[PDB]
Each structure stands twice: as structure tokens, then as C-alpha cells.
């Protein structure tokens, strides 16, 4: 009879020590909080990537008697066993804050049992498996191996109750087998999206008619069925099934046919982040360089809005964003407003570096700054040297360079400040460019919202916008992320962690989470789920307008409010949901033993029903 | 980051008065940073910093290829071709021409046709030894002093 | 302070394209500062920086006094 109190934890995922997904970040940022709790009882397991593992893993020698404590011996012999049978792997530490221990199976050292396994899978779970699909070959390989490893452990270990957490389908094949072979681990499966969710939303309706689609048919339609089956099989074979967000839990219910037992939101290592004025000034420098020759508005009266993230035109809501800004521009012209909104779109596209036109802008305004500085320290010297000697300060020499530098700013007649900072490797087909053309936001002086597409990551060493993303974000006034498909939404979340009011939606994971915890705290949530497409856009313009018409003091209220929401997103608090999931996996596995530890019988239908 | 962590710990000790000063936290981030510098086996430091819009036909690249200066460790002269004007605000070589020139040791301008040669001349006005030629305008003028 | 102001005024005019640059406020605090440098008539710049705890006897002082520097 096993120890529920002092248990083992094995977290499995494709991303363990190779950034291939956004799960990499979850796992990496969670390490610290879980390593603190489980110390050397915790291991992450994943497919060894032979291209990268050396940049991320402190390779350890696992055979040395020191490598493991005495109670943790069994894992070591468990590994020992695996090597006998010719299963090669890299034990080691994953070089991140927390430095959790890691088992990385060489999928090549097992590639042999390929056919034998594709078969054994189909004849226990009816999961088809074409040979042209490497990922599933890899995901089956990984699966059989880990299940193998865990049986071994469960065999040798007999003191520790064993929980095994699996993330996303690619690391889920182990889940059916663990249930089939009646292996003595309680299992947990978290999905960070559904295959069908992505695929259905990859064209341009969803959140309404998802409850009435024939999944078996739609998976078919996408050449996905075998992948779909692994994702479902994992979801039913798990003792506890979870998703990262409420919104995704609803998608999972109907697309995978099992109602999630709970939600495991993504937290951040909030210390890792924790200025606005100091950084806003760097954005100012950019704007003067960009609107040189026709800089006709007041920076003390302009607001900076931004959107950022992967370039997913429809799914990240770049379409709503631009459209809403065009409609925000009308409202401000008609209302006769005094303010300007310069709106950045930071979304990496294929590009051929900066446009000549945008490089010049900056260089000429930088030289103006230099000349002014040289000229005024000259006046300084002259005023002071007069005063100290007691008993037009600009000489002709300075006037001439001053004049030259100001003439350098004039721009060709009828030429407007570019809507893009880079050379697009597809100017004609680009979804963003074409959408801001359609709405005719061309940065003309009449236009009260200005547009700036920057199709590349931000680095502080750039000739244009000399900010690192984190710097730029702080410098700004409002983040705008009208996402349509977005299981978590790190960017809005981490935007808020940095003390910057933001707009998300109720169909973002982060959004939906945030909903249950209004607008006074610097988070607006656009309803993209129940209003019609157009009413959603209009609600977005309302939130923007409201924000523009905010007094200097009304804004500093909000800023200060959101900044205090930051502690709500640390793993210190969100990690408690991983604990409910684990402890529900235990309660379900050893119902009897669990009653003895708690002093009664607690309810076991949800993680929240338990606690 | 790590060093000021140490400075803080050393001072705070002494000021309170009355061995691995690097905690585990710091050793991990140090080790990652060191491993991130490992280059793929057999990769030598490029001879060029940029993307050549005609890599195969380029006169400079082809000549340094024909002389086989490939920057391997045995080579006692390293070769860096930087096909672009120098600007302080660059990711790679953050210097203006004038900064860079000054920070070098020797400018080499073996010109064949050059009625003056402002480059070697201004090089010299910035206090840097330089090699020109008796067929360079500036060289010729210099030979008479 | 005065010159960084002049700086910002010259830069803002320029950046916006399309004579006394010292405004009255500055000329004032400038004048005050210059006037506070005036020294009481016939008071020369001292030959010493410190309060001498024996001003009359000190060899150094007396010798520079004797040579009337």
C-alpha cells in the first residue's frame, strides 16, 4: 500500500527541452514552483532532440550511486532496466531557473519497435497510423517508451504513489496503454487546444455551430482522423482530463466528447518581469523620425495603442483591430477630438529589412538632435563665460547647420508617413497591409489615428524602434488583442503583468479566465462569442473611444489598478490548480487510501468539487 | 547580473561583520549562456557578415576563397568582409566609420588607380598608421615628405 | 537649466517646420545669479581658504603678507 502524501511526479510533453511550441514556456516557467515542492521527486520526460539538447541540458551521469537518493533508487534501476533492453536516453538537468531533472528518450534507439507498436496500438485502441506522418510515428514511439518506463518504475517502486502528467496529444499515446496495462500510476492529461479547433478556425464560424458538427466526419475532411483519435483516446484514458482555459474546456467537451474535470490556466514567473515615461520617450523618438516633415500633432496629447504576437491575421484578430481603428478614426474626426492615436502592429512577416524611406526619417531627426545639442552647449559656454566674467547668442556658424538640419526634414510633396517600416516580401498579398489599405488609414494629417505596421521582432539595437519588446510594451498606453481563436493568449496576459491596460476577448483563454475575476482594473473584454461580428467591432471601438477620452488622472487610476492584478497571475497562485488536478488524480486512483488521509470521503467529479 | 549579485553578498557580509559565492541559481544561468556559444561541429567563423546578392560571382569572396583564408584556428590572420557602410546603430559592428578607423591599428589601401585617395588621407588625419602606394595621389604626395 | 530650455525650444520649432530665446523668466534668475557674484568694493580674493587658528603668527601667511601678494 502506497504513500499518497509523499508521491512522485512525471511530467511528459514534446516540448521538454526544445522550444517547438508554446508549451515549452508553460513548462519552463512552471519548473521553479514545482521543483520547490517536489525537489528531486519531480522529473520531466520528453523526446530527445539531437539538434538542440546540448544547448539546454546539463548532461548528468545517472549510474553513479550519488545520482539518486536511497528512496528514489527505483527510478534509477528503472532506467537501468531500460538501457539493458537498448533504450538510449539523456538524463540531465534542464538549464532553466529551477533546474528540474529531465529524461530525454532517444527516439532513434527505439525506432525498431516501430511496426510492432503501430500494430499493438490499433489492436487495443483502433488508432490508425499512416507511415508518411512522422509526428505520430514519433508520438507513438514516445508513447510506448514512456509507458514502458513508467510500468518499470511502478514495478520497482512500492513506497511512492505515482502521478504522471501528459501535455498535448503528441505526448498522449502513453495514456491508453497505462489504462490498458492497468499500470499503477494515476494519470492526468492536459490539452492546450484541440486539433479540430485549430483546423476549423483556420479558414474564416465556430463558437456557435461547434456543438453540432460530426467530428468523425470533419476530422476525416482534414486528413486528421488518426491524429484526432490519439487526442480523443488520450482524453478518455486519463484519470483526470484538463484544458488550459474555460473557453477551451467548452471546445473540448463537444469536439473530444469529454467534459474536462477542470482548468489549468497558464501562470507566469512574475518576478521575471518586475519606467513608462522613460520608455515612452523612446517611442516618441521613433514617432518624430517617422512623421518628420509633417509632424502636426502633440505628443503630450497622443496615445499609443498596440497589438502583438504571431502573425495569425484572423485568429489573433488583426482584422478587427484595424477595422476598429478605422471606425475609431471616424468617431474622433466627427467628435472633433484633440488627441491622436498612433497604433503599432508588431507581427513578424517575411521582410527585406527596413525601408530606405524609414531609415532616412530616423537618421535625419537624430542628426537634428545632435546639432541642437552641439549648438546649445555652445550657448551655455557663452552665457556662462559672460556671467563669470562680470563685469543673438546664436552665431552665423550655428544658424547655418541648424538651417541645414531643418531643411533635411522636409518631405516630397504629397508623400505621407509610411504605414510600414519594412520591405514586404509580398506587398500585394499581405493580409495586414491590404486591410489597412481597404480602410484607407494612410496617415494623412486629417487622420486622427495613425497606423504603423512593424513586421519583425523588436530589438533594442534597431535603427528604427530602439526598444526590446518588454521595453516597448511598457512605453505604450493600451494593448489590443481581439483574438478569435486563442486557447491561452500569453501576450495579453504578460502585457497585463507589465502594468499595461489591455483589451482581450471572451474567446481567448486568458480573456475567459479574466472574466471570472470590472473594466476599472485595466482589462476590457470584448464579447466575440455572443454578439454578431459587427456588434463586436462596435464594442471594440467603444472601449477604445472611452480610453481616448480618459483624463490624465483617470488613466493613472487604471494603470495603477492593473499593475496590482499582476500578482494574481504568478505560478504561486495558479500552481494551486495543478495541485487540485493531481490530488483529484489521487482521490480517483486510491479512493480508499485517500479517505484515510483526509478523514472522510470527498467528492471526486471535479477538481473544484474536491476542494 | 551574477557579478553584482556577488558584490552585494560580499558587501552585506563585511558591513555586518561580525566558499562558492555563486548560488545554484547563478551557476545554471551561467552554464546555459556558455553552452549557447557552442557552434555546430566544423562550423568556422564566417568570412562575411552579410547576405550576398550574388554569392557565387563576388570578386572579394571568390578571391578569399581562392586563397583559402577560412578562419580556421590554425590560420593566424582572420578574414572579415563587411559589405556595407558602418553605422553606430548596427547589431553587428556598432561604430561609425570614424570610430572604427580609430580603433584599428593599421589601414591598408594598395590602390592601383587613385588620383587622390581621400580614404587613406583621412585615415592618417585620425592618427592611424597606413599603407598606400606610389600610384596613389595621396601616396605620391606623401613620398615627397 | 536655462540652456536646456533653449535647447527644447529650438528643437521643437525645427521638428515642426513648417529674436530673444531667453524668455523673461530666465533673464530674471540669470540676473540674480550674476549679481550674487559681485564682491563688496575693495574686497580682494583671499590668499587663504581656511579659518586660521593663529592668524597673526603663522609663518606662511606673514611671509606672503610681507611680500604683499
UniProtKB/Swiss-Prot annotation, chain A:
Compartments (UniProt record): Cytoplasm, Cytosol
Q: How is its activity regulated?
A: Allosteric activation by glucose-6-phosphate, and phosphorylation by a cAMP-dependent kinase.
What does this protein do, in the record's words? Answer: Glycogen synthase participates in the glycogen biosynthetic process along with glycogenin and glycogen branching enzyme. Extends the primer composed of a few glucose units formed by glycogenin by adding new glucose units to it. In this context, glycogen synthase transfers the glycosyl residue from UDP-Glc to the non-reducing end of alpha-1,4-glucan.
- This chain belongs to the protein called Glycogen [starch] synthase isoform 2
**Binding of alpha-D-glucose 6-phosphate: at which residues?**
276, 280, 477, 555, 559
Q: What is its EC number?
A: 2.4.1.11
The residues that hold UDP are 19, 310, 491
Name a GO molecular-function annotation: alpha-1,4-glucan glucosyltransferase (UDP-glucose donor) activity
Xref: CDD domains: GT3_GSY2-like
Species, as recorded = Saccharomyces cerevisiae (strain ATCC 204508 / S288c)
- A cellular-component GO term for this protein: nucleus
Q: Where does UDP-alpha-D-glucose bind?
A: 192, 198, 310, 486, 488-489
Instruction: State the reactions this protein catalyses.
Output: [(1->4)-alpha-D-glucosyl](n) + UDP-alpha-D-glucose = [(1->4)-alpha-D-glucosyl](n+1) + UDP + H(+)
What more does the record tell us?
Answer: Present with 14600 molecules/cell in log phase SD medium.
Going by the entry's taxonomy, the superkingdom of the source organism is recorded as Eukaryota
Q: Which pathway, per its entry? A: Glycan biosynthesis; glycogen biosynthesis
Principal localization?
Answer: cytoplasm
- What are the alphabetically sorted keywords of the record? Allosteric enzyme, Cytoplasm, Glycogen biosynthesis, Glycosyltransferase, Phosphoprotein, Transferase
Gene3D superfamilies tied to this protein: 6.10.260.10, Glycogen Phosphorylase B (3.40.50.2000)
Q: Which residues carry this modification: Phosphoserine?
A: 158, 353, 444
Q: Which GO terms describe its biological process?
A: glycogen biosynthetic process
InterPro entries in alphabetical order: Glycogen_synth
